[PDB]
C-alpha cells in the first residue's frame, strides 16, 4: 500500500490540517499523476469555480478513462472540491487553504519551516554522509537482529511492544522473547525500503496509541523527505510528541543524533525516500550480492553477519560455515518447511534475485530458471489439496427447484459450488441457515 | 532610443520579484475563455464526415478520372514547351482529346 | 614422443572537406546490393544481409536529411539477375519499409554487375544533364556472371556521365577498381561495421561536381500548404496523386499542397510533380544544404597547458580540464572537445562567428 | 528515467523593453522575468528528474542565467535574478546593433542540451524541449544561421516552442512547424503566466491527451533576389541555388553563366 | 533479361532422386540453354 492509499483513507479534517504545511502540499502535488499535476497547476490561480463539463472537455476522448482516474484521485485526496455554482451548476475549485499553502511553497513568502543551523554554528562532532548511511544500516541490522532473537541486539522494550502491536512477534510467554509470526516471516524477506515502509504504515495505523498528532508526524516525515542528505536541522520548535517520535526514529537510525540533548539531527537517505515507500527510489545502490546460486541447488554466501545467515537458513540447509563464506543447499525439505512457516516462494525468489552476486548477473537470466521453477513447483505441491468446510444440498428431486434455490443462493452470495447436471451443491455454514430457511418457507408456500 | 534604454536599465536595475502581480483571476478568467472550447484560440471546431457525403463508387470513378486527366496533362506538359513545329499539332490533339 | 615427461608446475608461479568546389546539388542515386550466397557470411554480425540493410536504412535517412531534392533507387542482384526492388524517388518511409521487407530476402545465386548496371543506365538514360547521375554498389561476392562484355557497358556509362561507386566487403577486385577509377567513382573496402558506417557517411555528402557537368537554370515552384476549411464553401477535397497510386484508400483531404503549374494536389513534400514535372519544394529544403556551400573549417586543437586564455568553454561554460581545447578560427573562442565535435558535425556554425 | 529539460530563452532586448516602459503599459520586463521564474519552478516541481535551463538572449551576448519557499527554488531564483541584474546593469549600448542574438542563444542552448545528454547516464533518457519568448522585432541576417539551428534540433528531435509577445516572426512559425513545437502569440501580456502554464508547461506526451488550440497556418513563400518579391514559380540556379523570376544566362550570385546552348 | 554463364551449372544440377524412385529431371529452359552455350 503506497503513501497515497493511506492519505486517501484519512478524514477530511486531517487532510485540511495537513494542507497547512507547505511541505505536505509539495509532497501531495509531486505524488499526483501527470494529468493531475497539470490540472492543479492550471487551477493554481483560478479564484472561480470551474464547470465540471468544461474541465472534462480539456482531455482526449480516448484518455477519458485516465482523466476520470485522476479526477477521482484528486477528489479523494480533497485537493479540490465541488461548489454549488449559481443556476444549479457544479463548479470545481481547489482548497483555498491548500492552494494558498502551495503558492507559499512555490511562489515564496510565508515563514520558513525551521531555522537554519547556522544559529548554533558548525557542529563540534559532525559526521560524514557515508558515516550516516553506515550508521543507519547498522541500526536497521540491529533491529532485524533483535527480530531474529539473537542476544546481541538489546533494544528498547517499547520497540518490542511496537512490533507486537504490528503483530510481528507475539509475546505468548511474558519474560521470554516473543516468537515471530508468519507475517513477521514474510516481512523479514522484504527489501529494506519495503520493510521500513511497512513498519511506518503500521506505526501510522497505530499513531493514536501513543497520543501523538498524526498530522504533525506526517508533516515532519514529508519535511524529512524533502530535506538534504548530509545536512542537519534544528531540533527545537517541535512538540514533545514530535520529540519522542524523533527519538524513535533515531532508535531506528533514520535520523542521526549524537546526544538526546543535541539540537541538530541528520536525516538519512532511508528517511528521505521513506515517504515514497517502495517505489520512487529507482536508483537504489544496494550492497553487492554475495549469494552464488549453482545449478546443483547450492548457495554460497560471501557474508559474515548472522542476519544474512539466518535469512539464508530460513529456506536452505546449512552445510559449512567458513569465516567469509557459508555453504548451504536448497532442498525440497527446507523450502517446504519455509513455506509451512508462511513464506511464499515468490519472496524467496525475489530475495535471491535481489542479493544476486555480480558473477551471476552476467548470465542473461539472473538465476538458473530450473531452480526458480523447482521452488515454484515445491510451493504448488505444498498447496495441492483444496479444503473447504460446507454443507451439502443433494436431496433435489426437481430441476426447477434446484435452479431456483441456486439462483437465490447466488443472490445471497453464499454459494460454494454448484452442479446442475447432478443437481448437487455445497453452501457455506453461514449461508446454510438462510438458504435452509428459504427452502423451508418455499415448501410452506407450496 | 538611448534615453529609453537608460530608463529601462535604471527601472530594472533596482528590481524586486513579485507574486500577486503575476496574475489575477480576471486575467485568469480571460485566459480560460480564450482557451475555452469555441474560443478565439480554439479555431473552428468539429467538421463533417466527407466519406459518407460521397458514394464509394463515385469516389472510385473520381480516381479513374483523376488518373486519366493526369496522364493526359502529363503528356501535354511533356510536349510543352513547344520547341518544334510538330509539337503544336501534338498539343492541339492533346487538347482535343481532353475536350472529348 | 611428448609422453617422456611433462608438468605444469612452472605454470604455477606467483604473479574530409575539399576545396570550395561545386557539388551534387541534384543527385539521382541508385543503390545496388548483392543477393548472392556469400551475403550469408558472418563478416559483420549477424550476417552481411542484416547489417547491410540496417546501415542502408541509416544511409537513406542521412542522405535524405542532407540531400532534400535527391532520389534513391534500390536494386537487388541475385541469381545472376537484377530486381528493381524500389523505384527512384524521394520518399524515405517507402524505402525504409522496402528495406525492412527485404530483410527477410533469400540470399542465393551470384551478383550480375552487367544486368544491374544496364538496368540502372536505362533508368538514368533520360535524366536531365544538370542532375548528377551517381550509382552506389555493395559487392559481397568476388565473382560476377556477365551475359555480355562488361567493358563496353563501362564505355557506355562513361559516355552517359554516370558515376559509379563501389564498397566491397571481402577484398579488392580488379574489375571493380577499374570501374570506380574510369567512371570517376571511389572504391572502398569494409574493415568492420564502424568503417562501413564511415564509408556510408562519406557517400552521404554530395560528390564534387565534374567539369563536364552542366549548369542550367532549372525552374521550380513553391506551393504553400493550402488547407481548405469546411467553414469555407470552397472546401472541395481531392485525392492526392501520391496517395492515389496506393492500394489503400487515398488521402481525401480538403486541402494540402496544390501544384502552381497544373493544380495537381500532393499531400507530401518535397515531391516533384508527376504531371508537369515541376520540382515542388519548400524554402527550408533549399536552405537545408547551405552548410555544404559554407562548410565549417576545423578548429585549432591546442593543449590546455599551452592555452594561456580562458578555462571555460564558450558554448557550454564547461570547466575545461581536458588536455585538448579547440579554438575557433574566426572569433577564436574556447570550446571543449564535445562542443568542437558536435558543432562541426551538427551545428555547422560557430556561435561566436554569428555574434 | 524520464528526464524533462525545459530550456527557456528570453528575448532580453533593452530597446523593446524601454519602448514598452515608456508606453507605461501594465506589463514590464520584471513581470516577464517573474513569469519565467515561476514557470521554471513549476517545471522543477512536476518531477525530481526534471531539469531547468535558463539563458537570456541579449544583444551583447547570450547569458547563461542558470523563507517559506523551497530551498532549491529559492537558490535558483536568487541566481537568476543576480545574473540578470548583472547583465542588464552592465548592458551598455555600444554600437547600432539592435536585433538580438536569437540564433546564438539557440545555438548555446543546443550545446548545453548536448552536454547534458552526454552527462546523462544510459539508465535514463532525457527528453528535451525549448521554449522561447519573442518580444522585440525579428532579425533578418540571422535567418540562414537560424535555419542551421532548426534542422539541428530536428536532428536530435527537440521541440521548439515560441511565445510571441508583440512582434510576430514567420521564422519562429516555420521552426515550430518543422520541429513540432507550439507557436502562439499572447493576446494579453499580463496573462502571460497562465498561457505558459496552460499550454507550454505540459510535455508532449501530456499534450497528447490534452486538447490544445490548433497550430497556426504557416506560409513558405520565396523572395526573388533581384527584387525579393513574393514568387510562386521561379528559376532555381543549379550552382548556388539562387532563385530568379526571369530567365538569366549568368547568375549574379554564383557568377557562373548558365550553359544553355 | 540475359543471364551470364555460370561454371557450376553441371556440378550443382543433379538428377533429383526422390525417395519414391522418382527421377525428377526438373528440365528447365535456362539449364538447357546454359548447356548449349557451354557445350
Ligand atoms: Zn504540376
Ligand atoms: Zn563545451
Ligand atoms: Zn567562431
Ligand atoms: Zn548561381
UniProtKB/Swiss-Prot annotation, chain A:
A GO cellular component annotation in the UniProt record: nucleus
Gene Ontology molecular functions: ATPase activator activity; double-stranded DNA binding; RNA polymerase II general transcription initiation factor activity
InterPro entries in the record: Tfb2_C (IPR040662), TFIIH_p52/Tfb2 (IPR004598)
Record localization: Nucleus
The organism's place on the tree of life at top rank: Eukaryota
Pfam families named among the record's database cross-references: Tfb2, Tfb2_C
BP term (GO), one: nucleotide-excision repair
Main location: nucleus
UniProt xrefs under Gene3D superfamilies: 3.30.70.2610
Keyword Glycoprotein applies: no
Keyword Transmembrane: no
UniProt keyword annotations, A-Z: DNA damage, DNA repair, Nucleus, Transcription, Transcription regulation
Subunit structure comment from the entry: Component of the 7-subunit TFIIH core complex composed of XPB/ERCC3, XPD/ERCC2, GTF2H1, GTF2H2, GTF2H3, GTF2H4 and GTF2H5, which is active in NER. The core complex associates with the 3-subunit CDK-activating kinase (CAK) module composed of CCNH/cyclin H, CDK7 and MNAT1 to form the 10-subunit holoenzyme (holo-TFIIH) active in transcription.
Comment on protein domains: The C-terminus (residues 305-462) stimulates the ATPase activity of XPB/ERCC3.
Protein family: Belongs to the TFB2 family.
Name of the protein in its database record: General transcription factor IIH subunit 4
Organism the protein comes from: Homo sapiens
UniProtKB/Swiss-Prot annotation, chain B:
Subcellular localization, as worded in the UniProt entry: Nucleus
Description of post-translational modifications: (Microbial infection) Upon Rift valley fever virus infection, interacts with NSs leading to ubiquitination by the NSs-FBXO3 E3 ligase and proteasome-dependent degradation.
Annotated coiled-coil segments of the chain: none
Subunit details: Component of the 7-subunit TFIIH core complex composed of XPB/ERCC3, XPD/ERCC2, GTF2H1, GTF2H2, GTF2H3, GTF2H4 and GTF2H5, which is active in NER. The core complex associates with the 3-subunit CDK-activating kinase (CAK) module composed of CCNH/cyclin H, CDK7 and MNAT1 to form the 10-subunit holoenzyme (holo-TFIIH) active in transcription. Interacts with PUF60.
Record-stated family: Belongs to the TFB1 family.
Role summary: Component of the general transcription and DNA repair factor IIH (TFIIH) core complex, which is involved in general and transcription-coupled nucleotide excision repair (NER) of damaged DNA and, when complexed to CAK, in RNA transcription by RNA polymerase II. In NER, TFIIH acts by opening DNA around the lesion to allow the excision of the damaged oligonucleotide and its replacement by a new DNA fragment. In transcription, TFIIH has an essential role in transcription initiation.
Name of the protein this chain belongs to: General transcription factor IIH subunit 1
Organism of derivation: Homo sapiens
Residues of the full protein shown: 400 to 499 of 548
UniProtKB/Swiss-Prot annotation, chain C:
Residues with the Phosphotyrosine modification: 63
Single annotated GO MF: RNA polymerase II general transcription initiation factor activity
Keyword Aminoacyl-tRNA synthetase: no
Database matches in NCBIfam families: ssl1
Membrane-spanning intervals of the chain: none
Localisation: Nucleus
Zinc finger (C4-type): 259-276
GO cellular component terms listed in the entry, alphabetical order: core TFIIH complex portion of holo TFIIH complex; nuclear speck; nucleoplasm; nucleus; transcription factor TFIID complex; transcription factor TFIIH core complex; transcription factor TFIIH holo complex
Outcome following mutation: residue 259 to A: Reconstituted TFIIH complex lacks p62 and has no transcriptional activity
Mutagenesis or variant effect for residue 350 to A: No effect on the transcriptional activity of the reconstituted TFIIH complex
Domain of life: Eukaryota
UniProt keyword terms in alphabetical order: DNA damage, DNA repair, Host-virus interaction, Metal-binding, Nucleus, Phosphoprotein, Transcription, Transcription regulation, Zinc, Zinc-finger
Protein's UniProt keywords contain ATP-binding: no
Tissue specificity as recorded in UniProt: Widely expressed, with higher expression in skeletal muscle.
Pfam families associated with the record: C1_4 (PF07975), Ssl1 (PF04056)
Function description: Component of the general transcription and DNA repair factor IIH (TFIIH) core complex, which is involved in general and transcription-coupled nucleotide excision repair (NER) of damaged DNA and, when complexed to CAK, in RNA transcription by RNA polymerase II. In NER, TFIIH acts by opening DNA around the lesion to allow the excision of the damaged oligonucleotide and its replacement by a new DNA fragment. In transcription, TFIIH has an essential role in transcription initiation.
Name of the protein this chain belongs to: General transcription factor IIH subunit 2
Family membership: Belongs to the GTF2H2 family.
Swiss-Prot record, chain D:
Any one Pfam family match given in the protein's UniProt record, by short name: Tfb4
Biological process annotations from GO: DNA repair; nucleotide-excision repair; regulation of DNA-templated transcription; transcription by RNA polymerase II
Record GO cellular component, one term: transcription factor TFIIH core complex
Subunit architecture: Part of a TFIID-containing RNA polymerase II pre-initiation complex that is composed of TBP and at least GTF2A1, GTF2A2, GTF2E1, GTF2E2, GTF2F1, GTF2H2, GTF2H3, GTF2H4, GTF2H5, GTF2B, TCEA1, ERCC2, ERCC3, TAF1, TAF2, TAF3, TAF4, TAF5, TAF6, TAF7, TAF8, TAF9, TAF10, TAF11, TAF12 and TAF13. Component of the 7-subunit TFIIH core complex composed of XPB/ERCC3, XPD/ERCC2, GTF2H1, GTF2H2, GTF2H3, GTF2H4 and GTF2H5, which is active in NER.
Annotated source species: Homo sapiens
Name of the protein described by the UniProt record: General transcription factor IIH subunit 3
Key words of the record: DNA damage, DNA repair, Metal-binding, Nucleus, Transcription, Transcription regulation, Zinc, Zinc-finger
GO molecular function: RNA polymerase II general transcription initiation factor activity; zinc ion binding
ZnF (C4-type) ranges: 237-254
Similarity field: Belongs to the TFB4 family.
Localization: Nucleus
Predominant localisation class: nucleus
UniProt gene name: GTF2H3
